[PDB]
Design a protein around this nucleic acid. Structure first.
Ligand SMILES: [Ca+2]
Ligand SMILES: [Ca+2]
Ligand SMILES: [Ca+2]
Ligand SMILES: [Ca+2]
Length: 511
DNA sequence: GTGGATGAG
DNA sequence: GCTCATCCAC
């Protein structure tokens, strides 16, 4: 073309962390540590990534390494089923709390699958701890935050990164990177770097054409290009290419410092980034160009329900509501509402007004159908750019145990379990304080339980701290008094043995 | 006040 | 399955 398709404003926009995600030149990453629980146990027990590990809770498999998947094992399988698929399976139980003790521990070489009756982890008197995964997630998160200035913690084992600053900075100021033995960026991009410092452009002017020398610049990972398009055709391609290099460096830090492999999707938007991290795993990187977005969305493996908020009941409703086909629903959406989001909105408004439509149980807000259309229209085209928002404060934290047998036949038994709940909630508070770098302290505790006949009893009240800080023991004593109060409440009523018992903390002062 | 519904997968 | 924090019609 005469010039680039993009304006200076959209390139400069990369440098601002609150607006970068809105640029069509945005460069987002979704990084996933696959089979995370399996990885954590793998690395703790000195084992390799090719070792067929499964993370286990009782008789069920909660994480399955990819090495174990080569044998047709999945989470659907019980441990005994998986062992008929691979007799060399290395099942590793989660850490456990013992009823009445305030600490968790690992019992390696103990489990339901080991034949010795001496070496069992009884479900009745034990509770699973997930602290080891929490802790390890936090290490990862620390490394990510060091490497990048906008990081979103999407889950226990997944993050999003905004690479805009890093990319824009590389593009304009990195004098050390070189495309070949003889070629470096400072010389490759001299025109763009000199126009920019010059300041003579107008922010709405289009960028100049990419120079030929840059075209040699390499992508790291798997560039998704079914149609064999040109790899570098415009600035969004240059940025994405630089991002991939940067992104490979980060992932190597994770693997070098902690030993965890990752999957990674690289693209313009969050949603497209997540689809990409899942396209090939484990230990793979997938790049999706803006020009290949439709090639990617329509490759066959995706549907409207494949997107982040639509994998559930709303998604299924939408398929019905919109009369979409079970195949190629994304394409179907693009063409049936080809020109603007509004068409979809109106179509939505009528169906909203249809006779069959249930206002009472619908997951579609009729007041907010402006936003719904937009998300669909742009998600369909892969241009739905959400920001990397931070997770909002916790309102509530809960620890509980589903009880079977008579593990809870008296006040004393309940109190042994409350010790485990405090210990667990205490360490989770600690994780939060690190996440926030702010002191977190709950003011309200709530004890609840289900009786022999599944009736619910509950007591909430304030917890008062003899000190300025939070002391776990204060939490337990209130837990104990509520447990005692509800005992009195159920004397000649259905009660023991209990079927469920919980501790919930709320009303946090984040200070 | 909260049981049950909701999201990944 | 199942886990979890969170939201809101009842
Ligand atoms: Ca994951
Ligand atoms: Ca004790
Ligand atoms: Ca996950
Ligand atoms: Ca292009």
């Amino acid at each position: 073309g005469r010039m680039s398709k993009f304006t200076w404003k959209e390139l400069i926009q990369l440098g601002s962390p609150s607006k970068a995600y809105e640029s069509s030149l945005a460069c987002i990453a979704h990084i996933d540590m696959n089979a995370f629980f399996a990885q954590v146990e793998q690395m703790r027990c000195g084992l390799s990534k090719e070792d067929p590990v499964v993370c286990v809770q009782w008789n069920s498999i909660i994480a399955v390494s990819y090495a174990a998947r080569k044998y047709g094992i999945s989470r659907m399988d019980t441990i005994q089923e998986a062992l008929k698929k691979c007799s060399n399976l290395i099942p590793i139980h989660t850490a456990v709390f013992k009823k009445g003790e305030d600490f968790w521990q690992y019992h390696d070489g103990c489990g339901s699958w080991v034949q010795d009756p001496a070496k069992q982890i009884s479900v009745e008197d034990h509770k699973v701890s997930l602290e080891p995964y929490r802790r390890e997630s936090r290490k990862a998160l620390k490394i990510f935050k060091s490497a990048c200035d906008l990081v979103e913690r999407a889950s226990i084992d997944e993050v999003f990164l905004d690479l805009g600053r890093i990319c824009f900075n590389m593009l304009m100021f990195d004098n050390e990177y070189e495309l070949t033995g003889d070629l470096k960026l400072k010389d490759a991009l001299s025109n763009i770097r000199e126009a920019f410092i010059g300041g003579n452009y107008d922010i709405n002017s289009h960028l100049p054409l990419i120079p030929e020398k840059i075209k040699s610049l390499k992508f790291e990972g798997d560039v998704f290009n079914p149609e064999g398009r040109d790899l570098i055709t415009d600035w969004d391609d240059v940025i994405l290419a630089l991002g991939s290099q940067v992104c490979k460096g980060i992932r190597d830090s994770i693997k070098d410092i902690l030993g965890y492999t990752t999957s990674c999707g690289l693209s313009s938007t969050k949603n497209v980034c997540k689809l990409a991290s899942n396209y090939k795993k484990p230990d793979a990187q997938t790049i999706v160009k803006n020009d290949c977005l439709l090639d990617f969305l329509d490759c066959g493996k995706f549907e409207i329900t494949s997107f982040w908020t639509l994998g559930g009941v709303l998604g299924k409703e939408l398929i019905d509501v919109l009369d979409l086909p079970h195949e190629n629903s994304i394409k179907h959406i693009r063409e049936t509402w080809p020109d603007n989001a509004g068409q979809l909105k109106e179509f939505l408004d009528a169906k909203v007004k249809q006779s069959d439509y249930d206002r009472s149980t619908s997951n579609i807000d009729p007041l907010k159908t402006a936003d719904l259309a937009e998300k669909l229209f742009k998600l369909s085209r892969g241009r739905y750019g959400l920001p990397l928002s931070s997770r909002p404060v916790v309102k509530s934290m809960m620890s509980n145990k589903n009880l079977r047998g008579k593990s809870c036949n008296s006040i004393v038994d309940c109190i042994s379990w409350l010790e485990v709940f405090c210990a667990e909630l205490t360490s989770r508070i600690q994780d939060l304080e690190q996440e926030y770098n702010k002191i977190v302290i709950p003011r309200t505790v709530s004890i609840s339980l289900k009786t022999k006949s599944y009736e619910v009893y509950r007591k909430s009240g304030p917890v008062a701290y003899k000190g300025i800080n939070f002391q776990s023991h204060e939490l337990l004593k209130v837990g104990i008094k509520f447990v005692t109060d509800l005992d009195i409440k159920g004397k000649n009523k259905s009660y023991y043995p209990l079927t469920k018992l919980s501790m919930t903390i709320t009303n946090f002062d984040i200070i």
